[PDB]
Symmetry: D2
Subunit: 427 residues, 4 copies
């Protein structure tokens, strides 16, 4: 007998789901059966155990029926969902050292509590709050520890933005960087071509310590289905769009001190594009992006908390010129990939800043338009897509859809992770 266990240590995805990490666990479970089958062929019966911190039932994103739905899903295939002790209220999902330390201690605990039940463990840790688990396991776990293979992912402190990471983030990510040159069994999962190179030069990570975990979408999921032109209009009707104009649309987290999504940038570009209406959908009401649109005097449609069903309609209409992604340094943003796959039959084309993963998702100009991160060049970016014949429009639209089939199919890509890890499990 050789049972294999995949321990997903994730800061959200069962009790709460704001986004990002949450979505990765969403897609994770829906593909467990395919991985069970595929890994069966290599001779492993795979159990999934998922670890997530205790939350208090009053937290942003808390859904108790999603919690039970996730708990029975893993029970039914011989796994388990284990709520983990961090050191908090339970109402944040983040914090500092105490949290990162309690949570990484008991995550390492879960990884050993199931390295005894099993014959091998691939422990996928994500976020600085779980960066201390690989060294915690390899230092003290003894023979249980040689069974585990660690792939830590989802973020390592960098200098690529103006924000200086907190001392706690620096400390945690400093550990895994150390334990990758101390241990066979410690690797980093890169979510993109960008973070692949960045993390190897910033941290002195050995070349073989890097294992692929490239960000992606579930192409064949229900939410990415192609809509027809009135289901388009029904959902767009409530959003109060202006009766005339073409649209450039963006969505994601609101802009904050650490994180700059390029919303103000397009509002300033629009000052100089006669028939364009920016449509910016933030996760919370942003009063300043209005005050800016008022100052700059550009007609903007600003919306809050919009369902991906009403956005995937927006991205599909014949009135939508482009979807715009202008983050400061996005390590693994997937919203651009969703925009190219949801506009395969009809839609916007993708404009992407020249900063993070953004250029590799648009294949450096072949599947999208890349602009520098300034108002004059984003105005030019919008103009260039306008100066596109009906035929160059849909050959680039086809090439984008062809890109998410080729490099960003989640099915394809978490098998790439799993197989890369299971190879290292030999002997």
């Amino acid at each position: 007998g050789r049972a294999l266990a995949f321990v997903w240590l994730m800061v959200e995805g069962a009790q709460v789901a704001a986004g990002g990490v949450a979505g990765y666990v969403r897609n994770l479970l829906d593909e467990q059966d395919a991985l069970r089958d595929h890994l069966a062929e290599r001779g492993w019966s795979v159990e999934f155990v998922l670890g997530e911190p205790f939350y208090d039932p009053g937290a942003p994103g808390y859904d108790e029926e999603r919690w039970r739905r996730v708990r029975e899903h893993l029970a039914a295939r011989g796994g388990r969902a284990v709520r983990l002790v961090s050191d908090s209220d339970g109402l944040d999902g983040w914090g500092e050292e105490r949290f990162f330390h309690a949570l990484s201690a008991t995550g390492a605990q879960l990884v050993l509590d199931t390295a005894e039940r099993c014959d091998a463990v691939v422990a996928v840790s994500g976020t600085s709050a779980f960066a201390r688990v690989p060294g915690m396991v390899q230092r003290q776990g003894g023979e249980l520890a040689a069974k585990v293979l660690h792939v830590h992912t989802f973020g390592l402190a960098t200098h690529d933005t103006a924000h200086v990471p907190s001392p706690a983030e620096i400390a945690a990510d400093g550990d895994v960087a150390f334990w990758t040159r101390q241990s066979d069994r410690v690797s980093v999962g890169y979510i993109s071509r960008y973070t692949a190179e960045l993390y190897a030069r910033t941290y002195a990570i050995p070349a073989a310590a890097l294992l692929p975990n490239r960000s992606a979408i579930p192409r064949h999921a229900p939410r990415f289905g192609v809509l027809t032109e009135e289901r388009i209009n029904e959902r767009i009707a409530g959003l109060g769009l202006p009766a005339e104009g073409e649209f450039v649309v963006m969505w994601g987290r609101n802009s904050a001190p650490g994180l700059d999504k390029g919303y103000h940038l397009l509002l300033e570009a629009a000052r100089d594009l006669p028939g364009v209406v920016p449509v910016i959908a933030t996760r919370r009401p942003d009063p300043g992006l209005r005050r800016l649109a008022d100052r700059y005097a550009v007609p903007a449609v600003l919306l809050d908390d919009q369902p991906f069903t009403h956005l995937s309609a927006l991205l599909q209409s014949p009135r939508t010129l482009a979807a715009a992604f202008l983050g400061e340094a996005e390590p693994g943003a997937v919203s651009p990939m969703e925009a190219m796959w949801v506009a395969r039959e009809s839609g916007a084309l993708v404009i992407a800043a020249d900063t993070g993963n953004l250029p590799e998702v648009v294949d450096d100009g072949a599947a999208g338009i890349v602009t520098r991160r300034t108002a004059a060049d984003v105005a030019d970016a919008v103009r260039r897509v306008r100066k596109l014949t009906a035929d160059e429009r849909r050959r680039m639209r086809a090439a984008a859809a062809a890109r998410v089939r080729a490099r960003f199919d989640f099915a394809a890509n978490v098998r790439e992770l799993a197989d890369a890890a299971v190879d290292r499990l030999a002997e």
Copy 2:
């Protein structure tokens, strides 16, 4: 169905056994069946789960066959032994905040990981390294947390000695003191009449927050059996005792900065007692207690690492005048109790300083001789036992044995703990 679980969170007793905590777990398991039976009568099927930190197989006191013997013992009655992630080498058994914090996080984890399996949990935590578990559980564990009843024991930072506790010890014991006035479900286990009063006045612990866990011996164990006068002489023969003299004997940890066992005190008393030979058995060779005996010019027998089989012979001989216990402030020392029960048919009588639990174990003079902690009064203490007729000698020897039957029978006393906790479990 109502299964009950007892989680013993202890810093030693399975992989290593130096002493103190180790011995408490020794006696703990040998009485599990009696508690299972007794608690059955109250309507609870009781599982035992034991938590202890990962050690590296090179640590002082590490015995791998004791580890498996303890692991199969709990497996065989439906429990488990869970090795816990602290944050260390694994070669100390103590440390500072990081250790106390990792270990108390994953101890709280174990307590919740088994509060889900069960209907009620009495979690016995011991030492500052597990003081943060009660608040960790009650703060974040939600409904799982109302199932648990916490009794933290074995030591709370005090001012009764000249040593100032480390800042980490102050921090940990500061938590439990807080959570006892925050929560129904948090209590302190006092191991003695002394620490009972001390901890209630030092920490502002509510009167009902105190639950009994009074230190004790397993009377009917094999090691406390009464020996006959040549098995006495065989074991004493190798120890190189002087051919003439009567003995005053002491044993325990060597004297150190935080801890003062009163060894130097008796050596100085002996300066003024003509027929007395101090016999001091430390756990390591003490070169200074020799240099002192050389300075003071008293004939002393100093021994290292001696088996309780050779000490229980020493305490039983007709040449042994007294066993002496002169600790600075002993909260729960049990070596005095072992000395009175091992000398029931014949032996030494007990001299005890006026400081810690020492006076309550000798019943304030009725089962032993109490002295102040100075050389002149310990010399007087030895003299007084000499000035004891053959008849007052054995009526006090009988009264001591009667004391360990009445107040320090481990059987009797961990039932006292268990029943006190299970009562609080109502509703």
Copy 3:
């Protein structure tokens, strides 16, 4: 020669001033000359050194010209203002362990760096972020440490509200509680009769370890001057009050998870008081206290960020019935004291909940009206002040003003602190 130094370790008051602690430092400096003179008479030349954490010039409450004005004020009398290393951005003023630990290390540093320059030091520490300084100084500072006398003040973790203090707050305040029974030189400054009793029963603080620091106002300051009836009307004109009605007014921090100021309570009482208009002035715009006033259907005047000049006018008008203070458990709220002294010639009377210091500032009914913290009894409280003849109104108004002269004169009260500390400095 015997120079004495007062080290004020405070989390705000020079670079930033939100409120509370800030105001205490405001009043602190304006009375330094009086203390220098008064302490001169006892034979001490007193220097003031003030310690406050580094802030980044973008923080809420940052005023660089107040920083220089405070820096030259202390330079000019032979003291100094020392910006202290905490471990942060510098943009919060609070945080967790890392902050509390860096800031208390370097606060203890400052206290020793000036215990060498001087002959005695009274170090007034305030907030959990400086609770670890007394033990840090007394443990390691040696002979420098016997020169210092510590009075830690401004807050100790309690259970009197529904909020459970963070683990870091519990840890810090757990230290000072320990060091008060370890050391002569460690005391707690109680800011009120309430926190005096609360802290002695919660923490097992020795009776002599408690030293007075009772909260207060600077009576004779410019802002508390009695206004005349049109300067009243000028400032009230912009605030958009309704042309008919009598007023019940409240102000302070907005209501939050840890802190409940009783704003919603009065809005619910007003449902049943025909001629009353609640006027609630929060520090930020509160959208929920509007939605509540809309639900409850009561006419409320809600205002943001209002200057004490426009509030002291509101409290003085003949149309103002009462000022209301309904905090959950206010340890040292001073806004009630400002309301009684600013309405000596004419104004509101004070309604106070039965919870914190609130009852002792209104002398248990003799200088104000005390109500239970529920909507029906606050409605009754308002009614009772209405049922007050013109003559019982102004005899209670006189008795209140007489109370702040007798017990809450800041001049009188920080001399009470200083003298209580300097007495302990003998020998």
Copy 4:
């Protein structure tokens, strides 16, 4: 005016002096005048401020008259010695996070408390216990922080030995590694050619972030003076050497878990060298290196706590064949350099393992004999020096002395540090 300050943040050297760091401060002060003069020529009046943690007067290495002698030395040239708050007893000199964190907070405090007094600061930090000071200063110190230039030195966690650095050491050294690619003003001082390359590949330190601080001796000091052949014999007489034999000598810290000095290696080589007597001088009595010499049956002279005056005599005698240095991975050991300079007229030659700085101090075979770290090759190393004519002996002895004049003159080398730092101070 442009005053410059050098802040030496060092864990020992004033109150205690065990060795290593202590000696570096010894040599540091004796050369302050030369640096003051030399830096004067570049236009800087230089003050020296030294920071060291509070110790308790009972600590190993505590010398109060060395403390005052160091305190008046810096006072007399316009500097100061500042005792720093760490978070301890004060009786260790090392510890874990709490210590490293308190000590680095108040070290950063001292660096800013004197960046205000001055126009520029070169802050030399040493050891993991001061690694967090550069980021602490550059993050929060604002304009004061642009004045400081940081050179952290003396050790960065590595994997070159079998020992795994503590998690606290990994955390601290992880900070400085981050802040060197975040900041102009953060550099690493390499003490050797070895650690220069090691640290740049382990930590991804930018090439320009590396500044020289190469370890060295004060050639012209009193202790390195050439002795004549009876002052040789007087000091060797008490040491109980055997009347016949040639000597191979080693000294330094005793061998421990983290640190392996190669003592057992030579004892095993001696098994196969007929006329050789190993003379090993440890800092404490080593009972195991005797038991080994007894097992291996080799005549060894083992000595404790020997004064450099009796060792520099041993290294100078005609009966001394070689001095041996066989550390596992010595980053900056200077005892080899002392051995080559103290045997310029007559002495031993130097045998050096192939591991750390050891090969670069013997210039790869030109100034010494390099061996692999095994008993058979150390036996060969001793043989090869025997197979050396009287003339190849003293041409290699001359080339060694020529090496410490050329690369390891402390005078020359701390000027190299100072000048490298002051160049970066431009603008």
